[model samples]
Target: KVFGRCELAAAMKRHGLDNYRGYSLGNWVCAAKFESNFNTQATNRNTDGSTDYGILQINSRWWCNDGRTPGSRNLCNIPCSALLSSDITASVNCAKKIVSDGNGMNAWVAWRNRCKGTDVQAWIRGCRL
Candidate 1:
């Protein structure tokens, strides 16, 4: 588990994601909170029979293959499990590719429904970015 949002911000910044790629630290941290509650080992089973991996809750159907699924495209070319760890480089890379493909963080349903249009300044309130 992560210490808090500050850790997330610092990690994202280390990954070269500190307000890069048109996404703010607020956006990334908010997605992490909604998707996995800041746990690196988090996973979610979707109604479509696919699983979401890691803190970003990236889907296995398109981004990575878990082998249990039949039609995994695995565009990220990395195992789904690669995302479910303290090292988030793979997830960040895949997330960037996803964002580069289209509507930014709108690729993430949580970011769209929960984080978008919200007062996300509080996410980094106590953190020294």
Candidate 2:
């Protein structure tokens, strides 16, 4: 339970994924479950025949390749790839900084606010730390 990507494992080790290996694993999975069900390659469609892509359900049509320029979503893929290379924890840090240099890093706050007092809420928030 809760195995794969040993490096990522160590990254989220203290977060309780190893302990709560029964349910989902770690805080990222819980939040990712709510966000996109851990589908790292997930995507969505646009009414205009376009598409979104990647783990976070980030429309690749706009975020990765074959898209427009000047504020397109291509730049967003950096963190996604980082997640793949290193681990989800790194991805979270990368996103936190990239999202706004500080905005994306507050998942702990999000955890505290959304998952407070749910047994794993604190673990979720403090897992990646």
Candidate 3:
């Protein structure tokens, strides 16, 4: 859970590991764009027909009532802001796992990866709330 109230920028300052463009607001938008398009309440409908849940992309298989305590998974458990705590750090780690394996690129890379083939910046444009 969040430690206190702060802007999205401050949250990234506490949680992000790299020189991300636009920080927290941008980070959340990017994560949302790729994962579930900013739906904190979004759920994943896998091609294999299984489901994952939550905003931080928590896996319900480990944290749902059928899995475990709700929101216990590091994914959905991320607080909206504040200290950006251990849970947020874990989420970042999870994101890296997806990227290192080439599932996709982070915002910076996504912006330039396509050689202008696609609109990667569409999600991040005007990313503030």
Candidate 4:
């Protein structure tokens, strides 16, 4: 599912990403926009054989287990396929774990390049919180 900007914002907020780990809802929403364009089924295969999955582009190398990423830590203890689901529950939970694990949003290159230190609030403007 490719979410509309406001739809994704609302969904992310419902998942409690509003201020999870000191990052605002806009940060998450902005990262999603740049990472996967809010497409729940988005996937990106890295040169190292790791794959980034879902809206936030959670990686298979250290996060989800894709069974194809060599030396995968599977820190999230979940199948990469789970992140591709439109439900986004597992995706959101795994994102929280990523931040809670001390990586912060910097774990996502898209966030660093596109969302970090910017007016992320613009990503969710006019969307009722």
Candidate 5:
């Protein structure tokens, strides 16, 4: 399911990402915008052969099990397929794990390159949170 900007913002906020790990709702919304364009089923394959899955694009190498990523830790203890569901609970939980694991939001290259060190308020400006 592809979510509108405010819809995505509300969803993430409902999942407690408003100020998760010192990052604002705008940060999460901005990252999601760039990572998957709010498409729940989005997936991307990295040059190293690892695939990123879901709205937040959790990776297969260290977070989720895809049954093909070599040396996968499955740290999130979920099948990578779960990330693609329109219901984002698992995706949000896995994202929280990623943050709590001390990687912060920088775990995502898209977030690092696009959302980091920037004023992201515009991403959530008109959203009724």
Candidate 6:
């Protein structure tokens, strides 16, 4: 699903991800923007030949399996297509697990380069928590 910023924020807040793992909601929101523009169907081929899945870009190498890719940890135990749902429950849950593994939001390079250290309120300008 292509989400408006407010729609995305409300979804994250509903998922209790606003402050997940000591990270701010804005961080997640901001990172999603750069990572996938909060589009559930987003995908990207990484330099290492792994694919990024969903809004958080959970990687096929460690978090989920794309079937075509071998040797995945599949920690989320889900198909990569599950991340492309508008519901986003699977994506959000997997993202939670990804951060818990280590690196927090640093798992996504977009977060490190763009979402981090910025005034993230702009990411959810008028969203109601």
List candidate 6 segments past 4 Å from native. Answer: none
Best-to-worst lDDT order: 4, 5, 6, 1, 2, 3
lDDT of 3 by residue, 67-91 (tens): 3333434333433231123344555
What's each prediction's TM-score?
Answer: 0.93, 0.39, 0.40, 0.97, 0.96, 0.95
* lDDT (Cα, tens digit) per residue for candidate 5, span 32-109: 999999999999998888999989989999999999899777998999999999988999999998988777988888
N/CA/C clash count, model 6:
0
Give the Cα-based TM-score of candidate 6 against the true structure.
Answer: 0.95
Better of 4 and 6 by TM-score: 4
Which candidate has the highest lDDT of all?
4
The whole-model lDDT of each prediction reads: 0.85, 0.41, 0.40, 0.92, 0.91, 0.87
Candidate 1 residue lDDT tens string, 37-76 = 9888999999888899988998988998898776768999
Q: Candidate 1: lDDT over CA atoms?
A: 0.85
Select the stronger candidate by TM-score from 3 and 6.
Answer: 6
Best candidate per TM-score, number? Answer: 4
For each of the candidates, the C-alpha root-mean-square deviation to the true structure, in angstroms, is: 1.2, 8.0, 8.3, 0.8, 0.9, 1.0
Off by over 4 Å in 5: none
The weakest ten consecutive residues by lDDT in model 3 span 76-85
lDDT by residue (1-129, candidate 6, tens digit) is: 899888899999999898899988889999999999888899999888889988888888988878867676788999889988889899999988988877788888889999788999788787787
Worst 10 contiguous positions by lDDT, candidate 1 = 16-25
